[PDB]
RNA sequence: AAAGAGAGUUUGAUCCUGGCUCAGGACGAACGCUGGCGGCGUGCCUAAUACAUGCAAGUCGAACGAACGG
């Protein structure tokens, strides 16, 4: 059992001949708070259809994201097109300091206290993407010693 | 140890670049409506413009020639 977040519903147009036609567009976060999340996109004619397929689709593209302490191990930079992110570690009680759309990936991820700021564009699927691309850098201290051949009190 | 929040706006709809505007904090402040108290501080930022009237620099008879008091 899934949490689900609505983000942004924009609605969108095509031209045809006699006029237009108006389509809803749903950009939705879904995770559970232990460390999956994963977000979708979606389209319909009316604003509940375009969240459910969002939801379907959500759910075949989650991550795990690896946190310490209810923290994230170290600082890293995503970036995905217009649109990039930087992620921070912060002290034990100071909560999610972060911008509209990267809130929901890292409420929902589980990630308790956590320093972001956005270096780059508004929109908002570009922030989810490049927020991502923040989560996939991240690595854990006991996989770290794994690959160096140490362990893991010899690396810190 | 500490450690950074965004939003609106170009388009039929989109993604970038890019300016404008907004949400926060601080004044030796002024103005508008209103107004109980106590403690601690602050009060000519302009004309270094012109100034009534009072007071802000005196003291020593144990350094040298006086007036009340027989
Ligand atoms: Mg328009
Ligand atoms: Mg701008
Ligand atoms: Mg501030
Ligand atoms: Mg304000
Ligand atoms: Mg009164
Ligand atoms: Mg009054
Ligand atoms: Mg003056
Ligand atoms: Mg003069
Ligand atoms: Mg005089
Ligand atoms: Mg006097
Ligand atoms: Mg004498
Ligand atoms: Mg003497």
């Given at each position: 059992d899934l949490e689900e977040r609505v983000v942004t519903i924009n609605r969108v147009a095509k031209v045809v001949k006699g006029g237009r036609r108006f389509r809803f567009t749903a950009l939705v976060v879904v995770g559970d708070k232990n460390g999956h999340?994963?977000?979708?996109?979606?389209?319909?004619?009316?604003?509940?259809?375009?969240?459910?397929?969002?939801?379907?689709?959500?759910?075949?593209?989650?991550?795990?994201?690896?946190?310490?302490?209810?923290?994230?191990?170290?600082?890293?930079?995503?970036?995905?097109?217009?649109?990039?992110?930087?992620?921070?570690?912060?002290?034990?009680?100071?909560?999610?300091?972060?911008?509209?759309?990267?809130?929901?990936?890292?409420?929902?991820?589980?990630?308790?206290?956590?320093?972001?700021?956005?270096?780059?564009?508004?929109?908002?699927?570009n922030m989810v993407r490049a927020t991502i691309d923040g989560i996939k850098q991240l690595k854990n201290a006991e996989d770290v010693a794994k690959l160096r051949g140490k362990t893991v009190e010899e690396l810190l």
């Open positions: 999340v994963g977000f979708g996109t979606g389209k319909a004619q009316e604003v509940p259809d375009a969240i459910r397929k969002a939801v379907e689709d959500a759910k075949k593209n989650m991550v795990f994201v690896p946190t310490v302490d209810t923290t994230i191990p170290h600082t890293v930079v995503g970036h995905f097109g217009g649109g990039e992110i930087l992620l921070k570690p912060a002290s034990a009680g100071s909560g999610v300091t972060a911008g509209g759309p990267v809130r929901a990936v890292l409420e929902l991820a589980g990630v308790a206290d956590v320093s972001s700021k956005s270096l780059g564009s508004n929109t908002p699927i």
